[PDB]
Amino acid sequence: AQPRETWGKKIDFLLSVVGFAVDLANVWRFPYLCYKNGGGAFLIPYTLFLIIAGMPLFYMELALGQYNREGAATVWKICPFFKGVGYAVILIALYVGFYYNVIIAWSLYYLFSSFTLNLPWTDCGHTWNSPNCTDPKLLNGSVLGNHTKYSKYKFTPAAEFYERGVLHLHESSGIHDIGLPQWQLLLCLMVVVIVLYFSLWKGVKTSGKVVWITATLPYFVLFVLLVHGVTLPGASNGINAYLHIDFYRLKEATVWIDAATQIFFSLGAGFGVLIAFASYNKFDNNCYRDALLTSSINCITSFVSGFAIFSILGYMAHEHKVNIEDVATEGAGLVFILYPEAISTLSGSTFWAVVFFVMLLALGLDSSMGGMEAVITGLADDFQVLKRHRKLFTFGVTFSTFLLALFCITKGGIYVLTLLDTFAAGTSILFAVLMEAIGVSWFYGVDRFSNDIQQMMGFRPGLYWRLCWKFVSPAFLLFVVVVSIINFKPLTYDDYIFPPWANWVGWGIALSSMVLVPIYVIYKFLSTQGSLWERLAYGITPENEHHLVAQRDIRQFQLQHWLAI
Amino acid sequence: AQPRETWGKKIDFLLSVVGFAVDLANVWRFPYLCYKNGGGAFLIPYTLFLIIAGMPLFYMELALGQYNREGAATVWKICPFFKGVGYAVILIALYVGFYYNVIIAWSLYYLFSSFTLNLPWTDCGHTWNSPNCTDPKLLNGSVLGNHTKYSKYKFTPAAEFYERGVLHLHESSGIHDIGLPQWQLLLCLMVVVIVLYFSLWKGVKTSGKVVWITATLPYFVLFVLLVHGVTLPGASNGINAYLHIDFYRLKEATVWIDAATQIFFSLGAGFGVLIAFASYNKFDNNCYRDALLTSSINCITSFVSGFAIFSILGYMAHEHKVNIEDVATEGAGLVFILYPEAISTLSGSTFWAVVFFVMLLALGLDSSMGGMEAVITGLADDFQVLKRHRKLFTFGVTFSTFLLALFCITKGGIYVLTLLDTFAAGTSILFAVLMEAIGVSWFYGVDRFSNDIQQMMGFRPGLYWRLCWKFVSPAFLLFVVVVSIINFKPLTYDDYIFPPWANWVGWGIALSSMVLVPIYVIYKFLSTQGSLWERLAYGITPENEHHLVAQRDIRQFQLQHWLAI
Ligand SMILES: CNCCC[C@]12CC[C@H](c3ccccc31)c1ccccc12
Ligand SMILES: CNCCC[C@]12CC[C@H](c3ccccc31)c1ccccc12
Ligand SMILES: [Cl-]
Ligand SMILES: [Cl-]
Ligand code: NA
Ligand code: NA
């Protein structure tokens, strides 16, 4: 038979795509970036690159998943030369998990630390926190002053518990000496992969069943946190500072460059996750309304998450006597630095901390389930043997992720967690989707894509989407790729500086995913027999239409195909 | 078809079974252990445990390979319950290579260093050697004194070049801080695996073609080295010290146990290598004469290698004015410490050094080819899919060995090379051969084994072999296992105290191979349907004789089977 597995409960697909859209990025990247770019001057470019990019790629991916009901790697049965591109979106799907699951363990250790009456991030001292030699200072009892940002000030109790209490960074000095993997983090990383295996072994049914909770919990958590925080003193400061009427902070090195990255990273369009989640769906399904609703809910959730984050920041600035400029933070780990301390500052800190940490666990587990579904599903469709042994392939993928995420849970965990995040999703996931858009628009045609969409739902997409898919979106992706490649800085942590070979290793990891396109192109060209004008016809023409290759009448070789809008 | 691949040239099988036994062990273990256990009082226990063990296991393995023409794992088609034991002899076959190939790279770097007019081990100084500020001392220019053994004296030029010049141990502090893998060793470890892949991809033909040289070279090398060394002043000292008329150093402890492990480690009997090299052989082949000749050549080669080693040691003691007690050496690396320096002490050091290093390279390549061939043949005869794609499976095995031997080529390479060597072949390979002998003698029967041997050649083995296979060899193996388990000392590499978790990791690595027997027994018991008295019949009875299982007439359940000699 065929693994259709259509969602009997229609709400399952919507909840799944919403969960895949809303992740920790919407929590910790949107608020800081919005203020750093201007606040009110960040929402307009966000909406601009949200209607010219994202939503177009989201619609394209949904249509490719529904019409071409197949896997992520095998979605290119209409353009075999770009099939290797699918492999890329699988590898990028794995490397990211190598650190992403670790970010879930960091959300579990704290969750285990929150089952107490006194929280460790409240005050200094050995409370599962390793204090330094008189360096940790109690800000509540010491009003002397501060000379660094709260993200850069590694002497606060919360930052101390994050660096030494959880990660144990005090016994690591770089990637050259990583040390031994922490066992308290190994248990928290093993429970996560066990849950992922037990939730992704039967198929998409249990996946949607777990999504039903892991997606609905964070919205309620954020709503309750906003209701509690808006009344706290300081929220009016942070909300009105990050959202100001005179939001004019635009330069050429600003929102027009930075909003281009957050959109793609927060939406999730252009990935095997959407191709898989749309393959297990009915053929006559409206995906335009889904493409609009998912992106709108994603943007509204990012907006309210920034609201809550800056309310927390304003409360912290009104309680620690610091200015809003110093409350702006950077780095990968931020939901663990400022938010647990702010929860501790309020009464009943245990309940709010447990709720926030179970929200972060639900979000992380849902995102990891999506990422591992992009791998387990989409690769089995290529190798028919893996389809029947789905439990075994799921176990193998989970065990490989567990055994290859040990470098990110070591003593220098953040030193091997800011290296994969920077290169795996930094540039590879951009060239991959650029090649995808090119193969879909210029090689498969936008008119044929529109006809397929009309056969799916019943209406042909307007000229706007047809022009954005071939002209606007590919140019946008190429521009972002050029900006990422040319404007490249050496990877450096808050204070640590990576050795020169670290950049080489990161670029090699990026190339491992990026060069999958030309390698597979050469493989397909050499593995086929015929003339030089016939091997080209195998790779730019649909498989199910290969019978027309003998007829010598191919639409692609005509001029009307490339100039169709 | 069937991959018979019988040795058309009969000399190929002999060279393969002989070269596989003669390796670096026969070079660096037999001489020191012989003198430590008595010298002339060590040849007698050697011959004793060479006729009650080894030769019996060698004959058994050759007969199992010739009669049961299959792989190492699937040689148990007559006793399925012990088939998992085969898996052990595969895994132990891989872990060893993880360090063994590294020992080949150490024989290549020196080989590349010997293409000069002045050798680096001659005198101190930066000559591809990293010395200390004032630790290295010129023995020719400084006759002050010495207070440590030449093995542990890390201030000699050759020892300095071995520790810091090649391995770069100065920038390592143990297994907790291994550092980055050395590239000068990475290239030498990659060339070796490339040669292994290009020599083991076609099959056993190119394997025998390469063995034709890699086995014939070391004998000529040792012969020329002995001819050159016997005339040097000092050889009469070392030869007469390690071989003395009053050789009486007898002790109840550590005099018969050391030979018991050295015989097994230097012969190779009881391994998938013999089962593989005998599977690709004619059915009507004399293996008794082969089992005798291979072991005799192995012992004679070990004897002459000890002769040459102690000739070199006596020359060094007569030249450096040290006593023979201080020239006795320990540790894994010895052919690189004393032998290159002794070659340097003679005129024309470049030629003798190149010859000795190409001999070491030939021996290492032969051993690695034998091990990888055993692995590939076992995993191919177990999984029929891997038989046709032999090139791809060979490439995968070589690439996995290259990517998993990077811990042994690091700055602290000898710290990850004395851990696998101690636990992989220390105890697991002994319990494996114990289970093999038990399943062959008590479960398959020695009378049936003798009948199979008679069907192979034409004569039934005598009562001596039939009694040693069931009584002497299993008791010997159990005694060696008990001594290795009870008399266990923590790993100490030149007074370096390994952390407590190192012993746990080593025992876990040993268990990964050892527990393959009960796990597979439970798997076979649960994976079969029937009564409790019928599931036992599937696993202790031959597969091709399973038709008798339904007939309720099984020889194993009778008393005459267990009491047959
Ligand atoms: C909006 N994105 C949220 C999901 C994060 C995600 C989804 C697939 C893969 C991945 C690659 C690039 C970017 C983001 C991801 C991944 C693997 C494991 C966990 C999470 C992921
Ligand atoms: C006396 N014969 C020496 C061969 C050394 C050998 C043969 C199989 C495996 C192995 C296990 C235990 C002991 C010795 C070995 C191995 C893998 C790679 C290189 C060499 C080996
Ligand atoms: Cl977003
Ligand atoms: Cl020997
Ligand atoms: Na999510
Ligand atoms: Na050898």
Curated annotation (Swiss-Prot), chains A, B:
Binding site for Na(+) 2: 21, 26, 266, 298
Subcellular location as annotated: Cell membrane; Cell projection, Axon; Synapse, Synaptosome
Binding site for dopamine 1: 23, 93, 265
Effect recorded for residue 96 to A: Decreased norepinephrine uptake
Record function comment: Mediates sodium- and chloride-dependent transport of norepinephrine (also known as noradrenaline), the primary signaling neurotransmitter in the autonomic sympathetic nervous system. Is responsible for norepinephrine re-uptake and clearance from the synaptic cleft, thus playing a crucial role in norepinephrine inactivation and homeostasis. Can also mediate sodium- and chloride-dependent transport of dopamine.
Subunit-structure text: Monomer. Can form homodimers in the cell membrane; homodimerization is mostly mediated by cholesterol and lipids, and regulates neurotransmitter transport activity. Interacts with PRKCABP.
Protein name, entry field: Sodium-dependent noradrenaline transporter
